[PDB]
Amino acid sequence: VQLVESGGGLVQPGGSRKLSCSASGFAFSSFGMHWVRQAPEKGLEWVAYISSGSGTIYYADTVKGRFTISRDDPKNTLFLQMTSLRSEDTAMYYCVRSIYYYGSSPFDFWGQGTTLTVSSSDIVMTQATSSVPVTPGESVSISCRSSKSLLHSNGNTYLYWFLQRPGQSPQLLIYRMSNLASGVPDRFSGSGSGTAFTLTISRLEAEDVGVYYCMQHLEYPLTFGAGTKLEL
């Protein structure tokens, strides 16, 4: 099925709420669950991570010891206990699953999201382009520049490309060299033999509209890039 998010609404500053993810219809006990938020006028950012069976719990550097992420394997649910809800946390929260093995597809599903509104040496990558005007059927490239290299001795670059349609949830795109996502047309083709990133999109359609997001998974936190709205 889909990852369904519960709770939300206006909350007092610094108080507590009841935020959870009542998700079902998926093999929950094998996924390295995540939590990703985004501001109403700003892009995505990672806020939490737990592995399968709560083996390893990570956090962003700005949320260390501030939120509590926990899983429940028999009910296939996903909790998020809050503490000291500042007005800076006025953001809507997504639930993301990620499987982790050789040739796997992490961040391959995103929930519909829940709205949390507060009432009264990290690697940095960014996209220079924003609000790019596009026309259907035209080849539109993308640009992302990272501060540190992502290659290894094995030869694996850890770039992740995403897409958020307007009024929807983010999806997945290229994440390796010539390795797309599921339910994605084959026109997309990521490139970049270094720390520069480019999507060689062959043709553009009406469904290829939204905001692209540049990601890494080499180190934590898994901070995103800047927004790149491919509007018409």
Partner: peptide, 15 residues
Amino acid sequence: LSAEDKAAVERSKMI
């Protein structure tokens, strides 16, 4: 080594 590799070896050790 890497976060994917660490999660892969922890999943392998769980299996």
